[PDB]
From a paper:
Here we report additional three new crystal structures of left-handed helical filaments. First, the basic structural element of these three new helical filaments is a [name] dimer. The other protomers were then assigned as [name]_B, 2ZUC_B and 2ZUD_B, respectively. A unique property of these left-handed helical filaments, as compared to other known structures of RecA family proteins, is that their DNA binding motifs (i.e., L1, L2 and NTD) are all located at the outermost surface of helical filaments. Moreover, the NTDs are separated a long way from L1 and L2 motifs. We found that the locations of the L1 and L2 motifs in the four left-handed helical filaments are relatively conserved, but in contrast, the NTD locations are quite different. The first hinge region, located between the NTD and the PM, is referred to here as “subunit rotational motif 1 (SRM1)”. Subsequent structural and biochemical analysis revealed that SRM1, a hinge region between the NTD and the PM, is not only responsible for structural flexibility of the NTD but also is important for [name]'s function in promoting D-loop formation.
Numbering used by the authors:
A (entry chain B), B (entry chain A): 13 to 258, 279 to 322
The structure:
Amino acid sequence: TINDLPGISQTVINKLIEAGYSSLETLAVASPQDLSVAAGIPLSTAQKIIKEARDALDIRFKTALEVKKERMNVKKISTGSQALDGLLAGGIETRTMTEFFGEFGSGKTQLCHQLSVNVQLPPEKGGLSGKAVYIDTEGTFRWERIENMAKALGLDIDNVMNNIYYIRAINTDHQIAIVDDLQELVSKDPSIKLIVVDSVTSHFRAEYPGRENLAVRQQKLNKHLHQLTRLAEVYDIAVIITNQVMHVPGIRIQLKKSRGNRRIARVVDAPHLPEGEVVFALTEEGIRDA
Amino acid sequence: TINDLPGISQTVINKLIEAGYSSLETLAVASPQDLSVAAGIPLSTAQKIIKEARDALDIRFKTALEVKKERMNVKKISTGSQALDGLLAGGIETRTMTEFFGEFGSGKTQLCHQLSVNVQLPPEKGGLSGKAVYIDTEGTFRWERIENMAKALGLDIDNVMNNIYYIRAINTDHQIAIVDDLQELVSKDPSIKLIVVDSVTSHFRAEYPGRENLAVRQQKLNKHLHQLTRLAEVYDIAVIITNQVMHVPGIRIQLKKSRGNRRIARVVDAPHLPEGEVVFALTEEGIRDA
């Protein structure tokens, strides 16, 4: 869980794990001299790691200055829930693939829809003034939902629906291919800033079912995810995937159910993001607060 | 505020609030014959209450010499609105918690940035030459604001944004843990004279739905608010908490809206401070008068 340390070499990371320092919490409670003599690492390097080890575990107060730097440095998309935006240090981020996995109805879909709409807002409103691309794997798209979310944001339905490139991926090959053709699609239309793949694992599970296949599944399935990650990294766009459930980087968020209207959000895998969970709701207007 | 009026039959206190004479300041400046014929209440009694309505907000005439003493004797943070400053008899005090509450847009938030910028100025300019710590609860912070405010006050934008410690509280457990560390922070940096928690109860209301674990939402909130109050009292620091709404808090100022720009402030409670209300405005420069 330490592979994500600010300004750190890969060589040392190894030496760190070798020495026996697996988690960031072991490094945290460590003494510079100790970690230094137990893995080569110059004394200056030993303490830099320890410092950064804490910053992730402990609470530190940045300054409104650094904040301005970051805010205008990278850019994110708002989910519609202030609570969730927080869990996501602002929201869905470009140049990175964020995944929402959770049981059926956990929020996954509505959130994909919400983002295909919110991405069109302006930076002032948690948007990036751009278009989305929804890749309907199991046939989950619902315009009745886009309309309601557009309505809530008092936007031109028609127009909002025209800013969402849509497409059905019926089997893995088509899923693999459509994605292959995203490079071209974005080149032709640079206003695209969001790629959405609902149920990415879906066909891969259907076609290569069982453990008798589990191997080459995650395999072909990881090559797919990389194709997506590379695209988000090269075109500076956000990629969102959903995986339905009861090692490919990017944020992984778990959605869960609470009493009827409410849902729980929790950070699983993610470097720059603070662990902990927050609640939000699924209303008629869409992904919003409780 | 009139319920607690000198020797008065509750039956009449009704006829008053029933005529609309809620606030004491309005009674104080009313006509015994215009009031008598408003709540039927006799002239004898009418007069007897208008006179008692004045002694209430009891006005004291000091010499310009007295006031120049007291103004220095006690350093308060101005708000940009001399009317609001008046309502607060100078400004926000240190070693005390002040609460602004009202509907989204009441000003409570901008008034927070305003303060995070004015605390930096020196006493003569309305500040305390201190630093501010902004605790973002629902993502209300905005740097473009701390900018326009630094601009209007002709400050060094960069240096103003460097004197504000910032941090977002994704949930209650976190909010709570940040305030615990708040103690250690002011020891670390004594230059801090202002703390601001925007929407203290946001997460509490949302994570403790309906009225259930209220056992602790309340137990927890108290220890959380008292905690902040010690902070202020022990470290000669001014503490500010906002609260959005459609027993501890030193001062409680309610804010309300008027025509899209003007906002009303009213002393809902606070020992010293003279009950009554005033009107200010939200400008591109910041919090000013109208």
